[PDB]
Amino acid sequence: FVNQHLCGSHLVEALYLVCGERGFFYTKPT
Amino acid sequence: GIVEQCCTSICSLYQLENYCN
C-alpha cells in the first residue's frame, strides 16, 4: 500500500479503494 | 479520525479499514 499524505479527493478515493466497494464513514461514530 | 491520520500526516491500509462500513 502507499505511504503518502491523502486529503480531499485523494482521501476518499484511497479509503473507497481500501473498502473495495464495502463503502465508508470517515469517523464512524456509535 | 480519517483527516488527522491522512491529511496532516501519513496513513495506511491498516488505519483506512477502521473507516469502512
Tab-separated table of N, CA, C and O in Angstrom, chain A:
chain	number	residue	atom	x	y	z
A	1	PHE	N	0.843	-1.222	0.000
A	1	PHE	CA	0.000	0.000	0.000
A	1	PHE	C	0.872	1.263	0.000
A	1	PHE	O	2.058	1.197	0.326
A	2	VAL	N	0.312	2.419	-0.381
A	2	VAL	CA	1.036	3.713	-0.451
A	2	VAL	C	1.405	4.279	0.933
A	2	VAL	O	0.770	3.972	1.942
A	3	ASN	N	2.438	5.128	0.972
A	3	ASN	CA	2.946	5.814	2.155
A	3	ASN	C	3.090	7.309	1.796
A	3	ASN	O	4.154	7.769	1.379
A	4	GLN	N	1.973	8.041	1.859
A	4	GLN	CA	1.838	9.427	1.383
A	4	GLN	C	0.695	10.154	2.116
A	4	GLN	O	-0.202	9.511	2.672
A	5	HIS	N	0.698	11.490	2.102
A	5	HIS	CA	-0.455	12.290	2.529
A	5	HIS	C	-1.580	12.125	1.491
A	5	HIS	O	-1.331	12.062	0.282
A	6	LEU	N	-2.817	12.061	1.975
A	6	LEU	CA	-4.051	11.899	1.204
A	6	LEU	C	-5.122	12.817	1.813
A	6	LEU	O	-5.547	12.601	2.948
A	7	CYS	N	-5.557	13.841	1.076
A	7	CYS	CA	-6.572	14.799	1.526
A	7	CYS	C	-7.595	15.106	0.419
A	7	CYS	O	-7.296	14.973	-0.770
A	8	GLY	N	-8.818	15.482	0.801
A	8	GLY	CA	-9.909	15.766	-0.137
A	8	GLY	C	-10.240	14.555	-1.014
A	8	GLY	O	-10.506	13.463	-0.503
A	9	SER	N	-10.172	14.718	-2.337
A	9	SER	CA	-10.452	13.652	-3.314
A	9	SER	C	-9.526	12.439	-3.159
A	9	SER	O	-9.959	11.305	-3.357
A	10	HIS	N	-8.270	12.653	-2.750
A	10	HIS	CA	-7.296	11.571	-2.561
A	10	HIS	C	-7.647	10.699	-1.351
A	10	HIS	O	-7.515	9.478	-1.400
A	11	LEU	N	-8.127	11.330	-0.273
A	11	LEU	CA	-8.531	10.669	0.969
A	11	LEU	C	-9.723	9.737	0.721
A	11	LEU	O	-9.674	8.577	1.121
A	12	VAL	N	-10.766	10.221	0.034
A	12	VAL	CA	-11.976	9.421	-0.213
A	12	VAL	C	-11.764	8.340	-1.270
A	12	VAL	O	-12.284	7.238	-1.121
A	13	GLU	N	-10.953	8.597	-2.300
A	13	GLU	CA	-10.640	7.606	-3.336
A	13	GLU	C	-9.800	6.448	-2.773
A	13	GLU	O	-10.111	5.286	-3.026
A	14	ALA	N	-8.793	6.749	-1.950
A	14	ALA	CA	-7.973	5.737	-1.288
A	14	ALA	C	-8.753	4.944	-0.230
A	14	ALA	O	-8.622	3.724	-0.150
A	15	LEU	N	-9.602	5.616	0.556
A	15	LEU	CA	-10.468	4.967	1.530
A	15	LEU	C	-11.473	4.041	0.824
A	15	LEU	O	-11.586	2.879	1.198
A	16	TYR	N	-12.111	4.481	-0.266
A	16	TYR	CA	-13.011	3.645	-1.074
A	16	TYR	C	-12.291	2.471	-1.757
A	16	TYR	O	-12.837	1.371	-1.812
A	17	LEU	N	-11.046	2.660	-2.211
A	17	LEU	CA	-10.197	1.594	-2.766
A	17	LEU	C	-9.807	0.550	-1.704
A	17	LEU	O	-9.732	-0.641	-2.016
A	18	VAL	N	-9.619	0.967	-0.449
A	18	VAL	CA	-9.359	0.067	0.689
A	18	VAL	C	-10.636	-0.649	1.135
A	18	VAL	O	-10.627	-1.856	1.381
A	19	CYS	N	-11.766	0.058	1.171
A	19	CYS	CA	-13.068	-0.538	1.455
A	19	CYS	C	-13.555	-1.441	0.307
A	19	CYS	O	-14.356	-2.337	0.549
A	20	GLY	N	-13.056	-1.274	-0.918
A	20	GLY	CA	-13.294	-2.175	-2.051
A	20	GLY	C	-14.781	-2.400	-2.340
A	20	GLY	O	-15.253	-3.534	-2.366
A	21	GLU	N	-15.523	-1.299	-2.501
A	21	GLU	CA	-16.986	-1.246	-2.674
A	21	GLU	C	-17.831	-1.652	-1.442
A	21	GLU	O	-19.059	-1.695	-1.541
A	22	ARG	N	-17.228	-1.887	-0.259
A	22	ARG	CA	-17.989	-2.052	1.009
A	22	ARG	C	-18.678	-0.749	1.444
A	22	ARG	O	-19.699	-0.791	2.129
A	23	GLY	N	-18.126	0.398	1.035
A	23	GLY	CA	-18.495	1.741	1.498
A	23	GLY	C	-17.726	2.167	2.753
A	23	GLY	O	-17.070	1.356	3.406
A	24	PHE	N	-17.800	3.455	3.086
A	24	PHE	CA	-17.088	4.075	4.210
A	24	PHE	C	-17.915	5.125	4.978
A	24	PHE	O	-18.902	5.674	4.483
A	25	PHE	N	-17.454	5.424	6.194
A	25	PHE	CA	-17.892	6.514	7.065
A	25	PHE	C	-16.640	7.077	7.771
A	25	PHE	O	-16.043	6.426	8.628
A	26	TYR	N	-16.237	8.286	7.381
A	26	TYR	CA	-14.975	8.972	7.721
A	26	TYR	C	-14.583	9.031	9.212
A	26	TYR	O	-13.397	9.140	9.523
A	27	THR	N	-15.543	8.955	10.135
A	27	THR	CA	-15.293	8.901	11.594
A	27	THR	C	-16.079	7.811	12.333
A	27	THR	O	-15.802	7.547	13.506
A	28	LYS	N	-17.039	7.158	11.657
A	28	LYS	CA	-17.870	6.032	12.138
A	28	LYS	C	-18.307	6.114	13.626
A	28	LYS	O	-18.017	5.188	14.394
A	29	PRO	N	-18.979	7.200	14.066
A	29	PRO	CA	-19.478	7.340	15.434
A	29	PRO	C	-20.546	6.285	15.786
A	29	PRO	O	-21.300	5.821	14.924
A	30	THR	N	-20.623	5.935	17.076
A	30	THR	CA	-21.575	4.960	17.660
A	30	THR	C	-22.911	5.582	18.072
A	30	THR	O	-23.968	5.010	17.720
